[PDB]
Design a protein around this ligand. Structure first.
Ligand SMILES: CN[C@@H]1CCc2c(ccc(O)c2O)[C@H]1O
Length: 288
């Protein structure tokens, strides 16, 4: 049989449909209803836009390349596609970091939260995030600064029917540091402090109203948030660092598999973040 030819296509199409439907529903729900327009919901809008772009562009052409085993399009479109991939991934991760910092400021400083965050300052931050995303994905790739120098890489670059990722040590390390590790450290610190604050509040409530009946929730929420992200993206950004240092340690198929596992995070974000009752009411009004 040829269960590989037809089997993988079904799964890839399902992934594309799930990503597109979820992100479109979130975006149109925020846009149509005036109640949902909040300074917290603009970051979710940027995240959903990045996920929608990735689902429409990065995934279908990668699936076609995998199934056909050749890059039938031009040589220019290979670099265009790589640039869009890197852009979307880094923009999404930094938007997640921005949301985490927003929550940190909301709980930690209750009185001064209103002054720090304003609709004017919630746009400058998003524009800066997207600009920083664009200055690491288009500028180095299109200027041919990431290109490797060895016989297989040179032969891949010369041929017009081969689109594979070969990169330098410097670009790999700098891209990984910019895209993954700094947001990871920021999120770890932020969520640790938020957990401390929640524990202090529970202690105070128990000490005050203990005689009447009157950390499972905090643990469950933080576990979902930080386990649907580290598990999805961490394994890839270790082999990314390793594969340049050691020539034959990491195979080429494991790289692509871990990369595609990383992409799946786009279709999960509406589930993780758009769970408020207002969002459910808006979804119920739109559909059904
Ligand atoms: C071909 N796929 C790319 C390869 C390297 C890379 C990705 C994402 C973010 C980065 O910072 C990267 O360096 C992947 O999406």
């Amino acid at each position: 049989d040829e269960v590989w030819v037809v089997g993988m296509g079904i799964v890839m199409s399902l992934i594309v449909l799930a990503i597109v439907f979820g992100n479109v529903l979130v975006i149109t729900a925020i846009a149509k209803f005036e109640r949902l327009q909040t300074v917290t919901n603009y970051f979710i809008t940027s995240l959903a836009c990045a996920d929608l772009v990735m689902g429409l562009a990065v995934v279908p052409f990668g699936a076609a390349h995998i199934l056909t085993k050749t890059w039938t399009f031009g040589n220019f479109w290979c670099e265009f596609w790589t640039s869009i991939d890197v852009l979307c991934v880094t923009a999404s991760i930094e938007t997640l970091c921005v949301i985490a910092v927003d929550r940190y400021f909301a709980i930690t400083s209750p009185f001064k939260y209103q002054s720090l965050l304003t609709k004017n300052k919630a746009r400058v931050i998003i524009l800066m995030v997207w600009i920083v995303s664009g200055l690491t994905s288009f500028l180095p790739i299109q200027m041919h600064w990431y290109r490797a120098t060895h016989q297989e890489a040179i032969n891949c670059y010369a041929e017009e029917t081969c689109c594979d990722f070969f990169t330098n040590q410097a670009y790999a390390i700098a891209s990984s540091i910019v895209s993954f590790y700094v947001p990871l450290v920021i999120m770890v610190f932020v969520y640790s402090r938020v957990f401390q604050e929640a524990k202090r509040q529970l202690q105070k409530i128990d000490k005050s109203e203990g005689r009447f009946h009157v950390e499972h929730k905090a643990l469950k929420t933080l576990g979902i948030i930080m386990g649907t992200f580290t598990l999805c993206w961490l394994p890839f950004f270790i082999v990314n660092i390793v594969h340049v240092i050691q020539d034959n340690l990491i195979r080429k198929e494991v790289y692509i598999l871990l990369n595609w596992i990383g992409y799946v995070n786009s279709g999960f974000n509406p589930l993780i973040y758009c769970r408020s009752p207002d969002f459910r009411i808006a979804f119920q009004e739109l559909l059904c």
